[PDB]
Design a protein around this ligand. Structure first.
Ligand SMILES: [Cl-]
Ligand SMILES: [Cl-]
Ligand SMILES: [Cl-]
Ligand SMILES: [Cl-]
Lengths: 440, 440, 440, 440
């Protein structure tokens, strides 16, 4: 599954339809990024640039020109063909092949952008630009506007209005096309296979980073080269650190390990968290905490649908958590009073759900307290957790337990579809899986 | 093998010994780097900061103060302990534990650097600073100096002299300690195992990125989490692109695949290139080119020693290449005339050797044309190659062949030691290895 | 004559009336400007900031908030009262006295602008900002918008639209109020008195800068402390340099001197040019060139009215010039052919008229080739000139003559009023004036 | 009196003599500075650039190259001749005439500085640069060094050492040549004539700015076009503001007026303060304060010599002031106790003396508390004052009195020479001067 040229074009046209006549929208590529000295990190295209292009080169700018209500056209600035640079560093699309390949009207050399951009903006009323995202892009846009402002003797005029296109584009990204959902479904499946592998490979004495290695190999083999974020493998007390990425410790017989990891497949993020016993068997204390977190997730999965909200579902999770913690003596008092004082917060200190898409923490307006009413086409994580610090004032057997269980869902007309349920989460199914692997 | 606290301290003292009395040297940590939106790439410490600290956190500065010829001391600025930030993002060393852990005299909060740095530089004659490396560091240094310059009413004085410490530090890095060599030896072994695995796993129909996956898994399993540079897997015509990293094509029965890949182990780079038949058997045309490149490498390995140079050894390689290409009809004319016109350059367009260490293209002065006389303790790559473009005006059977074979060596008193010779390169040994794997 | 508080308020309200509901307009003060080391040039307020405030302090920002179609209010950021700073450097308005004194609703300390501005912009749809004028202002605006963009967890929202208020404000400035015209009338009178003094004081052997001294003293004595631009006193060949400001030469018996100078009175520019004989008597060659330039000005003064344009009047001047130069043998050929080839351009290389107001080259749209149709309330210069270079290929007696004669006019319903006609320009009246002064 | 080409050359050579072999010193011109919109303030050359060149154009850089201990040479970058730019804006020296005119070895176009500077610095050990003075200069220097650092493949090398030349150059500027003293003597005389004129012109009902007008006219007529700093004319309570420059009030019969003003003559500052009765007659209260300030100045003038210090002389002034204020009942207590508690500070809150030269607050090291031992050739102001605030808790008749009296002196082998004593300061001589003028 992928996103095709025709869909990138549909997105460009949908933006244009929203644009004022006599306007241009500018979308800039991500800069290349130094890792050390002359070596660079593997390139990651800007999500919004990617969303409108499917083009994975730096030094590129998409310009959408809406001349008036019927006439519009696109111009790509991108790197010129250059035999020597390409022998050294890789092939470039160039100007001749770009219009056909990407579905744009014209292509120009990025080296000419300062000579050409002001000419494209001349006489327009509005420029749509995401100011403050990249410094290099701001310099280019501001130089172009300065040329026009100062060029009245040359009969040049600057647009007087600049509009941030991000609110509108991010609203577009919040509602996935069926094709986007198919890509996310594959991302979820790939990520699930990786987490299943990790459970099946995990043994006491292995290092946390070994499970990261298994996960990343599995992503790669299905054609998801890179993770969507830095893989978290938190065993024992490390599971109480939300984004623990050192992954440097030897995994101990008797500890849990919390794995939070996701692939990036055609630009789209998977994100799964599973927590399981390193030795294949939950202790009673671990199982008692696990059951509360699992009930939280299972209830959320039942509830998520059009017409509810992350806030409303969060309210149910909080009650499940407070009740469970009271039953175990981790909290003390009256459940409703405890809820009213947000007494769960020491143990569950993050949100239940975030949007998911081209970014793992995806774009889109949440509403105050994530109160926004859910609609079909929205994609989100569901990731309840409980983290009992090694020094917490709680019954001793619970100290140093960090559990999170996370699935990715798409809201549908009939509820939600779970994209990641092909990796097990019921404790008996986790145990059976690991018992089977441990017998091989 | 690793570099210990005591060695980081020896390096700090060696720098201090080179510093003028009444001076301070400032070494800044690498900034964290955005991958997309709020996600960051996995952190890579600045090589020089790492060289003097072994400390893998951002928002840190090492200050070495040489008060005079007998008195000197160190101050680390680093992130404060912060319960909430650490629950979210990971543990911090903090100020209390830093002196003992790193072997510095004092530690201060990085948040206080602007209030404290000028006070440390006040009244000194010289500040050692690597200007133009990081913008954030330059702002900090320039602000501190401006406070002092403008603070005579407060009896403050700025050093009048700024010296770039990089020439001296990079000369230090050019000569490896025995401990550094042991770490590089392990990096070479780990990288070799990965390349051996790739040859043993490779089959027609697999994608280039699959071999990258095998390689990276093998790095990880020996505790080298990250590559030292972006892995190159160039099959067929892709082998003619020096840094081909798309690794997106299906590998064809009948093509060669060139793999250029290396781990980063305790900060140090491995870098191996091996080229081999995708189907386990060189064609005659492929073997004819391969033999020239192999002779180039084998001769270089025999020759490299104290008292020669990369330039001198390059001269021998060029003769081997020109002679071989004439014998195959790829070049035409008299060998010595061809050499005099650098007729090999279309086919071998890069250098034979670069320094290797904390960076894959490591620091240190090469001399004009890499003429510098080699001495024990220097570490370098040896990476001859021949690249025949798919449209080259040469006998047709050679078109689209790209071959590189690269080992990592350390110069010793008796010659060189080869750190990477545990992965095969003789064509008959490559074939035997792949034949054996292909029978399983 | 001045501009009162009530008029500054009328201007603020007129801008607000043009603003979208749910918007804020930001107008920043000019930075103070270094002359040398710790000394600064005398402060000049930003013209647009001045236009809306009449407030002559740095470190100030006017914020006009249009909450909706009926509710709006103003906030001034300005320097706090500070006993020590004021003992040293002068009185400050402060926050307590500002609302009454300036006619704004609220005043806040400029030191609090970064803590307060984002709160004022929060939840607005539009911010009106003149981007690229001052770097410091851009930093403030961009920081505020970044706080809001990144502050959704705090329920903050950034306006998505930024509009340059300059096109609208500069259109306001292009049409003078009767009060503005009265101030300009006084500026013109003051400037005229200064030019009359210069003619009456001028003698051979005096330096060009001496006439600058007389002019500036006369400005000062009528309460116009500073010139509106750097005074030009170009004698002999120096008169052929349009903005000659060195004013360093001894004025020679037999040469002309061209004086281009104007006061700044309550923020408004005068601008007069007069050219006259240093020794009080035009030579024949000088008088021949002078008469053409004078006819140009006199004809322009007759023609300027509502419904014509600078371009149309320029066409008449060009014909007068080409005809006159042909008659003197400076040009050769047919007048209409000469006009068609813009043959006057070597000798008259600048425009006839520019707008005049708070800036000497005042703001406002000219139209292509200054074709805009004139309307009552517009104020402009009329400044024909002829400059014959010392090496020009023309009859020898004309070489090194530079003559410009300039008046300031306001377009009225019945034509124009001449603000500067109280200093003489007819050659016989210049001579009579100087003869009289030279007898004292 | 002026500074000639030969002296600028002597200064360049003296700097070179202090420079390391294998080094270059870079001295940049001042940027042009906006007054409003497209108008600029009259150009003021950077003092240090001026000190080494006598060249009053922007877009210029002096490069002093010391190749080794015997060979050195100079290169000027400056604006190219350009017929059109010069017709518009004034003559340029250009490259052809610069070597002879300024006494430099070579001249290059400023537009070529980025193509040429790195080539001049290539292979040098040291670059002398005043970092943080001008942003544009820092960009140029840092770009050049970056080219060299990154240009080893082109056999380029950057100097590793940057030294601030300001400490050494400012020490040079602190000790005036006889020629510099002659120029300062003329500046002092010109400034004195201006202050004498102000006393002779001053009448009740005139505005403070009128005296500024008289002063500036007098500067101009002696060929000092511009003041060395913004003229202060503080009458009544305004005299208690140290740098009162509004000069906007009507001067009242019965008030004092404090005038602090100085010309700039060939780059060098005069600085005189005189305080006198607006109506020509000190009241008793005014005379009582005046006498203390005058005794302070007269004693300072007697004492200043080689071997004392500003601090030591300040101690004498403080005793005179405390004693006088006790005698008048403005202070109460024991003189020595009052001195020990710095009880004079409310009334005398600034220093007694600052260096004087190309800047009014001239460069040079003062020592802690201005303790530096005075030597011949140093030039300084002597400016005691007493300022009694309108709300001070003191006998009522003293409120709103601000008096300062300032002369400029040069330290000599036999004491000091007073450069400004040709304007009167004894109260009876002030009165007699004004009585005489008031009878005309
Ligand atoms: Cl390009
Ligand atoms: Cl910190
Ligand atoms: Cl303030
Ligand atoms: Cl130039």
């Amino acid at each position: 599954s992928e996103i095709s040229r025709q869909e990138f074009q549909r997105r460009r046209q949908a933006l244009v339809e929203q644009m004022q006549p006599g306007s241009a929208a500018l979308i800039f590529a991500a800069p290349e990024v130094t890792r050390s000295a002359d070596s660079e990190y593997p390139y990651r295209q800007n999500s919004d640039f990617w969303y409108f292009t499917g083009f994975n080169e730096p030094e590129a700018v998409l310009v959408l020109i809406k001349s008036d209500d019927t006439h519009n056209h696109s111009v790509l600035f991108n790197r010129v063909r250059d035999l020597t640079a390409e022998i050294w560093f890789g092939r470039r699309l160039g100007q001749d092949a770009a219009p056909e390949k990407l579905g744009v009207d014209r292509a120009l050399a990025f080296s000419e952008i300062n000579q050409q951009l002001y000419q494209l903006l001349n006489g327009l009323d509005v420029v749509y630009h995401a100011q403050g995202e990249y410094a290099y892009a701001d310099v280019i846009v501001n130089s172009a506007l300065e040329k026009l402002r100062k060029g009245s003797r040359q009969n040049l005029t600057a647009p007087a209005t600049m509009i941030d296109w991000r609110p509108v584009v991010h609203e577009m990204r919040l509602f996935k096309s069926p094709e986007e959902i198919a890509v996310l479904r594959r991302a979820g499946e790939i990520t699930a296979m990786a987490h299943t592998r990790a459970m099946e490979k995990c043994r006491p004495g292995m290092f946390e980073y070994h499970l990261e290695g298994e996960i990343h190999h599995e992503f790669n083999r299905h054609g998801a080269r890179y993770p969507s974020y830095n893989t978290i493998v938190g065993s024992g007390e490390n599971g109480c650190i939300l984004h623990y990425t050192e992954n440097e410790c030897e995994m101990r017989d008797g500890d849990l390990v919390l794995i939070d990891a996701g692939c990036e497949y055609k630009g789209y993020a998977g994100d799964i968290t599973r927590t399981f016993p390193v030795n294949g068997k939950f202790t009673q204390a671990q199982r008692e905490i696990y059951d509360i977190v699992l009930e939280s997730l299972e209830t959320s999965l039942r509830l998520y649908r059009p017409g509810t909200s992350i806030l409303e579902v969060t309210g149910e999770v909080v009650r499940i958590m407070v009740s469970g913690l009271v039953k175990l003596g981790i909290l003390k008092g009256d459940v409703d009073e405890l809820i009213a004082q947000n007494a769960h917060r020491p143990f569950f200190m993050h949100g239940l759900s975030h949007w998911l898409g081209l970014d793992v923490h995806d774009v889109g307006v949440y509403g105050q307290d994530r109160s926004r009413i859910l609609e079909p086409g929205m994609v989100l994580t569901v990731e309840p957790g409980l983290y009992i610090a090694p020094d917490a004032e709680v019954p001793e057997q619970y100290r140093g337990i960090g559990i999170r269980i996370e699935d990715d869902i798409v809201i549908t007309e009939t509820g939600n579809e779970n994209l990641t349920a092909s990796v097990v989460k019921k404790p008996e199914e986790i145990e059976a899986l690991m018992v089977a692997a441990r017998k091989q």
